[PDB]
Amino acid sequence: EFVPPPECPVFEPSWEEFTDPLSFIGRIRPLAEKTGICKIRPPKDWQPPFACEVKSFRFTPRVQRLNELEAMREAFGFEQAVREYTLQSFGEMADNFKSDYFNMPVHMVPTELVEKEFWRLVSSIEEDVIVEYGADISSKDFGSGFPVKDGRRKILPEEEEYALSGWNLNNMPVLEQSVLAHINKVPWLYVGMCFSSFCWHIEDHWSYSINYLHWGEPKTWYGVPSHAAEQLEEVMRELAPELFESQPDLLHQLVTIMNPNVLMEHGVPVYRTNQCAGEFVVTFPRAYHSGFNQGYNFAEAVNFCT
Numbered sequence: 481e482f483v484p485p486p487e488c489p490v491f492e493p494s495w496e497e498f499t500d501p502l503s504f505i506g507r508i509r510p511l512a513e514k515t516g517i518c519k520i521r522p523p524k525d526w527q528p529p530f531a532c533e534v535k536s537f538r539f540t541p542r543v544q545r546l547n548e549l550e551a552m553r554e555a556f557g558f559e560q561a562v563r564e565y566t567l568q569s570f571g572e573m574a575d576n577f578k579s580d581y582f583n584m585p586v587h588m589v590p591t592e593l594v595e596k597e598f599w600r601l602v603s604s605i606e607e608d609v610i611v612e613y614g615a616d617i618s619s620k621d622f623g624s625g626f627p628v629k630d631g632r633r634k635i636l637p638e639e640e641e642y643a644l645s646g647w648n649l650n651n652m653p654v655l656e657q658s659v660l661a662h663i664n665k666v667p668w669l670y671v672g673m674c675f676s677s678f679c680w681h682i683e684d685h686w687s688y689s690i691n692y693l694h695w696g697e698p699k700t701w702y703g704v705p706s707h708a709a710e711q712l713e714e715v716m717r718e719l720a721p722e723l724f725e726s727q728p729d730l731l732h733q734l735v736t737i738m739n740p741n742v743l744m745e746h747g748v749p750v751y752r753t754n755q756c757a758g759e760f761v762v763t764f765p766r767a768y769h770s771g772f773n774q775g776y777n778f779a780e781a782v783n784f785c786t
């Protein structure tokens with residue numbers, strides 16, 4: 481069965497250390513860059529409100545078949561596809577799926593069991609599980625999960641500090657330095673369900689990324705330090721299908737699903753974490769990462785530069 485990778489570092493900064501995100505990330509970098517990903521728990525009293533317009537939040541999630549690669553059928557390409565949800569109707573669907581699958585209330589399912597079942601389903605040719613992921617939803621559509629002082633929604637006085645916080649993902653620096661920037665991005669939202677996932681990838685321009693789970697069940701992460709990036713790519717090339725082996729990385733990254741134990745068997749260091757509600761995950765430059773959701777949750781993410 482699946483062997484869980486060792487845990488990535490978790491930081492619990494003081495109020496003093498929590499003042500500037502880039503300053504804090506610079507200081508933890510000697511350790512966190514050696515694990516690729518790390519988790520940051522804000523001070524207990526730091527609780528931003530959820531500012532998305534939930535009334536009109538409607539979306540069509542992407543259909544994901546967990547075992548599509550291992551499955552390499554009559555009328556293929558028409559198995560399942562788009563259907564619009566609200567945040568509420570998606571959550572009802574998500575909870576019903578998980579509780580029916582495990583035959584228990586969703587919050588009683590151990591995280592280690594969903595993890596073991598996810599990787600079993602990914603490689604199983606006998607059971608075909610299909611889930612849905614409301615993801616790559618632009619925050620410019622229904623607003624950010626964080627309050628923003630843009631004059632499009634009410635902000636109570638006690639929420640102003642979160643609209644102005646450096647840990648508000650809308651306030652991260654995103655402009656990359658270049659001479660082209662002298663001659664010449666927004667957060668994305670992720671509505672997960674049980675087993676919805678993201679495959680192994682790095683960010684464009686090898687950027688940092690920062691990720692906040694606003695609410696819901698945990699998001700399980702795997703990360704690989706940047707010094708092992710080429711080792712992971714070599715393992716990918718050896719074990720990937722021949723038809724996908726020669727594809728450009730940006731396209732190959734669409735189907736780069738691989739059990740972490742396989743990477744670990746080849747000597748690639750992999751670290752894991754369960755990002756719970758109210759916690760940040762930071763990925764460092766060229767740190768490959770992948771993961772899946774334990775249940776109905778809501779995440780916000782952006783690439784930033786230092």
Ligand SMILES: C[C@H](OCCN1CCCCC1)c1cnn(-c2cc(C(=O)O)ccn2)c1-c1cccc(-c2ccccc2)c1
Pocket residue numbers: 542613614615616670677678679680681682691699769779781
């Ligand atoms: C590379 C990719 O660019 C997304 C920007 N797009 C904007 C629109 C045009 C096209 C590019 C990207 C970046 N970050 N990122 C990610 C996501 C999570 C998460 O899901 O929590 C955690 C950590 N990182 C991912 C990602 C990686 C693999 C898979 C999926 C995915 C698959 C199917 C359905 C939904 C999402 C997303």
Ligand SMILES: [Mn+2]
Pocket residue numbers: 681682683689763769
């Ligand atoms: Mn990413």
